Design a protein around this nucleic acid. Structure first.
Lengths: 64, 114, 149
RNA sequence: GGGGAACUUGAGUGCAGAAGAGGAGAGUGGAAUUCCACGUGUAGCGGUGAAAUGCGUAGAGAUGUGGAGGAACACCAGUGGCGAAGGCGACUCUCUGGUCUGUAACUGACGCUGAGGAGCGAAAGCGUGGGGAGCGAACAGGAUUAGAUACCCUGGUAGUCCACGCCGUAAACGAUGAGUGCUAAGUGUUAGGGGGUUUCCGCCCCUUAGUGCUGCAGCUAACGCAUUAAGCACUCCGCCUGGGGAGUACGGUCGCAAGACUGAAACUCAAAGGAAUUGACGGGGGCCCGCACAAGCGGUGGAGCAUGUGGUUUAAUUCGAAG
């Protein structure tokens, strides 16, 4: 029920920083949806785009 | 020859069990088709029990003892071969739930009623 | 609907050894009283002569050797008519064992009924009866189809 | 109505912002499937209600490496978002469209609709050159069956995919044409804005534009609709006049073709329909009972005989009875 990004008012993702994406990806490799994250709607799409570019860049794994 | 993987295919039609070297060299394998369960009797957990325990008993002639097992695909053999391998006396470290789910893959066959 | 069970023809309550129990009552599934009990007593005796030991002892040893533990029932699921085995309740066990005892007692075909039942008592005390045969038959076929449940 | 002078709300231009699977082109990544080479590996794999056809001792399936290739982008994902509609989900870049909020810095009615006309327009199909992994009409075999050109199994061609043209149709649906204004409320949700709190974390109250669900008034034959009207009104377009015959015939107009658009009549019927009610039925669902089935026992039909009935025959085999 708490949105992390509005909680500290952080702006756009800056995809190079990764450790938050680490705890936004499941341990088997999929994205945690809003049912468990509870983020705001307009940030979830830039989140999933960010972890997608991370996956293409091979810092975050497709499967684990 | 002390460890390796157990590969078990559970299907709606048949249950397969295979032991192999850690780098993939197979020693022994079994299935309900091997033990004579023919038709759709190959899908019962009891035949999964029997095939798994007889493959574990065929593992002894090269003498592996500790094991990790990969369960493959859905069906009643998902847990039956697991309990059979654990009750067979051979040490199992953990089970792995890997499924060959793609992202999309090719389209499946036609919807099997019409 | 509703499971019911009931006592029938039990003997006197106190000091009921099974020999006096089936001496005064019990088994008697041949028809009516008279030419059902007399004959049973004669069969019971012609085996004391044969083996000089306790008739009721060898009788329940015969019953024990007849006792099954598995019985199969059929099912309509699937177009192949699978059959499923279940554990037999003890009352069903004793009545069914006694049923096969009496039916191949009358089926086994000797010159008269008392020696027929006498030879059946011997051939069920030892494991060479037709009832012992069918006992192992259903036992092994239940073990064959035991995979279903 | 015509002419002349106004004005800024309608419609617009600027300025500041926001969101989007909007579109065209190019490049890139991963999971699987298939196929091939090799290592290990025995005897089955696979398949269904049973099964069988197939594939396997010429080493299959299983299993791990290493390639080849084409396909669609898991999770994200939401009665979410975008687009006029068909439709658009992996990522990156180029180009390009559109929508909404504030703002009144400028024009001053430039607006609406739209016959003809023009352009887009799912899938299947057609033309030329590619490509062809899986899938898979046709077709082959094996099943099922009284029969099975099908449902089922194993294969499998065209196509599905790309480039460029053509066809121009669908249940192309919200079965609701477009624009404008008015009319109780409640509750989500998208993208914005403003005020009090602090200009934080997030609280409240407004606020436009959508987007869902409820629900007044009103309306409807009823179902129901209801600020995203099927209410109240106005403008403009398209369309209907009983069911068949029939979107057929003729004749034009396109199309390479399949066909598409335009579209009668003769004859014939007295109905066809929509919504709802009560029943019945369901190889629909939820509960329950009955020697209904199960668990057993004894029987019938196998034999003779008695009796009733049918059929046949007789002069008549007296009539009535029929799951």
């Amino acid at each position: 029920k708490v949105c992390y990004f509005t909680s500290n008012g952080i702006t756009h993702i800056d995809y190079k920083d990764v450790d938050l994406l680490k705890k936004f990806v499941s341990e088997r490799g999929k994205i945690l949806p809003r049912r468990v994250t509870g983020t705001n709607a307009k940030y979830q799409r830039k989140l999933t785009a960010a972890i997608k570019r991370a996956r293409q860049m091979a810092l975050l794994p497709y499967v684990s | 020859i002390e460890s390796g993987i157990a590969h078990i295919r559970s299907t709606f039609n048949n249950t397969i069990v295979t032991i192999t070297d850690t780098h993939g060299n197979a020693i022994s394998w079994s299935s309900a088709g091997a033990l004579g369960f023919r038709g759709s009797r190959k899908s019962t957990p009891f035949a999964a029990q029997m095939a798994a325990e007889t493959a574990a008993k065929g593992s002894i002639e090269h003498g592996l003892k500790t094991l990790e097992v990969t369960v493959k695909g859905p069906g009643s053999g998902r847990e039956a071969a697991i309990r059979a391998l654990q009750a067979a006396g051979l040490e199992v470290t953990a089970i792995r739930d890997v499924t060959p789910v793609p992202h999309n893959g090719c389209r499946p066959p036609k919807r099997r009623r019409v | 609907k509703g499971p019911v069970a009931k006592r029938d023809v039990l003997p006197d309550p106190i000091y009921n050894s099974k020999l006096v129990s089936r001496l005064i009552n019990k088994m008697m599934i041949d028809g009516k009283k008279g030419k059902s009990q007399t004959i049973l007593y004669k069969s019971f005796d012609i085996i004391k002569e044969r083996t000089g030991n306790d008739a009721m002892e060898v009788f329940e040893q015969a019953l024990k050797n007849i006792m099954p533990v598995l019985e199969v029932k059929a099912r309509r699921v699937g177009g192949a008519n699978y059959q499923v085995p279940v554990e037999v309740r003890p009352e069903r066990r004793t009545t069914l064992g006694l049923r096969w005892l009496v039916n191949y007692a009358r089926l086994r075909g000797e010159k008269t009924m008392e020696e027929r039942l006498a030879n059946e008592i011997l051939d069920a005390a030892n494991n060479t009866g037709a009832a012992v045969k069918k006992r192992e038959d259903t036992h092994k076929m239940a073990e064959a189809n035991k995979a279903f449940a």
